[PDB]
Amino acid sequence: SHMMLAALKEKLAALKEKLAALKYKLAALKEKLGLTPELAALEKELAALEKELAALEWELAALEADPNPDPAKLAALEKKLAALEKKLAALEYKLAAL
């Protein structure tokens, strides 16, 4: 469980850093391309993924505090973070395609 928790925290931190970088890239594209509806949809998505990462971090905080973290809850968190990473990758592509 300890190794699992360490890997999940490292994954969470990595996605948080990517999130922030894309926020600055999106704002730069808004100033270069204008206030386009495509960018509005990407901004909506980035904001939702930011809300989800914050909620997942509360979940990880609880599991790290638990002296006997539930392995199934740990495995399910890995899957949620992997799903979020896929969405963040799809958003990063779209920003790089503008």
Numbering used by the authors: 19 to 116
Published text:
Here we describe the combination of rational and computational design to deliver three-helix bundle (3HB) peptide assemblies and single-chain proteins with control over topology and thermal stability. First, we garner sequence-to-structure relationships from antiparallel 3HBs in the Protein Data Bank. This gives core-packing rules, including layers of hydrogen-bonded polar residues, which are combined with surface-charge patterning to design complementary sequences for acidic (A), basic (B), and neutral (N) helices. Next, AlphaFold2 models for both designs are used to seed computational designs of single-chain proteins where the helices are connected by loop building. Synthetic genes for these express in E. coli to yield soluble, monomeric, and thermally stable proteins.
To alter thermal stability in our designs without compromising the 3HB fold and topology, we sought to destabilise sc-apCC3-CW1 systematically by modifying its consolidated, largely Leu-based hydrophobic core. As a control, we included a variant without a polar layer, namely sc-apCC3-CW-0NTT. All sequences were evaluated using AF2, which consistently predicted clockwise 3HB topologies with high confidence. Variable-temperature CD measurements revealed that sc-apCC3-CW with 0, 1, and 2 N-T-T layers were hyperthermally stable and did not unfold upon heating. Specifically, secondary structure calculations from the models all gave ≈74% helical residues. Thus, apart from the 0NTT construct, which coincidentally had 75% helicity by CD spectroscopy, there was no correlation between the predicted and observed helicities.
